[PDB]
Each structure stands twice: as structure tokens, then as C-alpha cells.
Amino acid sequence: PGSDLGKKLLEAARAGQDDEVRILMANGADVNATDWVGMTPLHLAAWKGHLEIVEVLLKTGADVNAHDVFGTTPLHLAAHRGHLEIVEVLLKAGADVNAQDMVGKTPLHLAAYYGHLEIVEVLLKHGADVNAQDKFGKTPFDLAIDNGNEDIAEVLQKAAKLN
Amino acid sequence: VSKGEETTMGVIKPDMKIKLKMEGNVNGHAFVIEGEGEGKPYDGTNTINLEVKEGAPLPFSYDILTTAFNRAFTKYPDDIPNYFKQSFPEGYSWERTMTFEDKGIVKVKSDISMEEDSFIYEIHLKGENFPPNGPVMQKKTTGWDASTERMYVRDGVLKGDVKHKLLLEGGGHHRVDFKTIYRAKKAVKLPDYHFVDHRIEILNHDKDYNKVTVYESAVARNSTD
């Protein structure tokens, strides 16, 4: 439930104020505070790329698989933005590698669209589905092609070969 | 051109293009719309041409989308700090909830950026709980009434509230409450309480609203005025 410390923690994560995040958590701030569009401190730290804060939030009980009102998880956000180490930390903490948002996109869809090859490879290694279709029938390969990410498209096309 | 307008003439030109993409899901139905247009930021006008790229035909009233398709397009007097134009080139984002009289709800967020002489929007919109036999899902709306948005600062950012009316076929209306949070991506001079008067209309559309042109005018003023 909403709390005053929760609101401040959301803002400190949103603003990238790492020291203030630590102060607020020390004083009892709810690490799973959620704003009116479903964002949590972990979402915000993952998007902003603040790895140390992602780690302490996970260590103190943040839900790694929280989704916002559009179905977006912290792993979606880190894959979108190209934050490789955060992707690794989220997966290690149990993030659903194949989570789908409200239009059916997975983290691999987003890494492919936004051109983050190293993240594509990490997601694949942890069992991301190359053939995943969003709600419009599109695969990560389709999105890589659409955005001219030819090296990623080759990786995905090779990985789509079945035996 | 006034003193206050000139301060952002270097960044925001008298004519600016618009490019946008919306990912949406209304009563479970996913869709994508892309838009291109242009507007006059200091005159407070903007026009966007929209195309449904995925999820056609839309099974619901297009009017629940049009206000999602940028307060940089607002005429501002010099004595009211312009939260939106000051935020550029870095830009701003907004989050909005629209609560409908029959308990339908829309939650939408948008990222407003700038590239060369264009604004770029990335929009995500979710509509839920619309009654199937209500005017949104039955496509029995005609448009939005003119409105007045109340702008005021809370928690270091700008809030906007609208007590809105969605007009219905046959002359009725449907109350809709808008609440928006506008967040500049850098420090800007914050305004006092003020109003923004809006008028939004669909100028053209094809039968299924796969192609739509939206027009909006917006002007800021003080409550006394």
C-alpha cells in the first residue's frame, strides 16, 4: 500500500539519487512501493542503469518480476536500454526471460529492436524464445530486420534453426 | 515575438514536425498506431495524421486515443513560465489517467523528445473495463467538448486536471476525469496555478478510423483572465 517513504523511494530511484535510496531503505521504505502506472523502484533503477541500486533493491526483497500497468518488467527495461550487467543481475535473481508485455513483446524483442547484441546473446543463453511472436505475429528477428540490426538478425536466424 | 517566446526560439522553432508511435491495448485488444504531423508551438496548434499499423480495425471509439496524440504546442503569455518549452531540447514525459463515467479507465504515458526540427513521441496506452454495450465499445461518441485543464505544481513537477466531457451520438455526454503528471527532464522555472484551454477535433477519417487526422488548439491563461 502507498506510503510516504515509498513515494520518496520511488522518486529517489527515478532521480538516480543512490545515497538517498539507501537512507530511505534504511529507515523502512517499502522496496516494492508502486506508483499509479505500476512502476517500482526496481523498474526505475533498471531503466536508469543504476546497477548498485538494482542489486541492493533485489537483496532487500524487491520483486524481480513486477510488471507495470503496460506489462513491462525490469528485465524489459534493462534489455530496452542496453544495460548488460543489470540484465545479468536480474536473470540471476530469477527474472522471467520470456515475460510478455501488453502487446506480447519479450525482453528479446526489445533487445533486438534497440540493437543490443550482447544482451540478445545473454537472453538466448538463458532460454529466451527466438520464435516468440508478439500480438501482431512478429518475432525478435522481424524487429531486428525492421530496424536494420543485421548482425542481430543473423544471430536470431541461426538460433531459429531446429533439428 | 515576445521576450519570453524568444528565449526558446533557438530550440523550438515556429514550425515543428511531429512523429509518434503508440502501442495500445484496449479491453484486451492490442494495436499500434503511427503518426506524422506538424504544428506551431507558439500559436498553440498542432495537426497529426495517424495510421493504424497493427490491430485494425479498432473495435472502440477513436476519441479515447486522440488526446494522447504535447503541451509544447500551447500558446503561453510571457508572465506564465512555460514548463514545456523550457524542458527542451532534453524534453519531458507525461503520465495520465482518464476515468470514465461508466468505470472504463485509460492509463497512458508518453515520452516527448526532439530531433532536429521534430518532436518525437513514444506512447503506451491501456484501456480497461469499458462496458461492451457502452458508447466507447459501441463507437457512439462524437468527440470531446472544449475543455480547460488546470495546471499546478506538486512535488516539484507539473500536474494537470481536466473535468472533461465526451460527447455522444444523440446529444448526451459522458463525464471523463483527466489527471496528468508532466515531468521535465531538467530543472525549469516552475509556473504558478494557471489554465490551459483546449479544443481537439478529428478533421478527417476513413470508415474504420484506420486513417485519422487530429487537430488541437491550446492556450494558457491565468485564472483571473
Author numbering:
A (entry chain B): 2 to 164
B (entry chain A): -7 to 61, 65 to 220
The article reads:
Here, we report the selection of designed ankyrin repeat proteins (DARPins) recognizing mTFP1 (monomeric teal fluorescent protein 1). We characterized these binders both biochemically and biophysically and determined the three-dimensional structure of one DARPin-mTFP1 complex. The two DARPins we report here bind specifically and with high affinity to mTFP1.
In order to understand the basis for specificity and structural changes in the binding of the selected DARPins to mTFP1, the crystal structures of the mTFP1/DARPin 1238_E11 complex were determined. The mTFP1/DARPin 1238_E11 complex was obtained by mixing mTFP1 with a 1.2-fold excess of DARPin 1238_E11 and subjecting the mixture to gel filtration. Gel filtration analysis indicated a homogeneous 1:1 complex, which was used for crystallization as described in Materials and Methods. We determined the crystal structure of the mTFP1/-DARPin 1238_E11 complex in two space groups, to 1.6 Å (P6522) and 1.85 Å (C2) resolution, respectively. Both complex structures are structurally identical (Cα r.m.s.d. of 0.3 Å): The overall fold of mTFP1 exhibits the typical β-can motif of the GFP family and undergoes only minor structural changes upon DARPin binding. DARPin 1238_E11 binds into a cavity along mTFP1 including β-strands 1, 4, 5 and 6, comprising a protein-protein binding surface of 790 Å2 and thus similar in size compared to other known DARPin protein complexes. Residues from the N-Cap and the three DARPin repeats make specific contacts with mTFP1. Interactions involve hydrophobic DARPin residues Trp37, Val38, Phe71, Met103 and Val104, two salt bridges (Asp69-Lys104 and Lys106-Glu15) and an arginine-arginine paring (Arg15-Arg178) stabilized by Glu90.
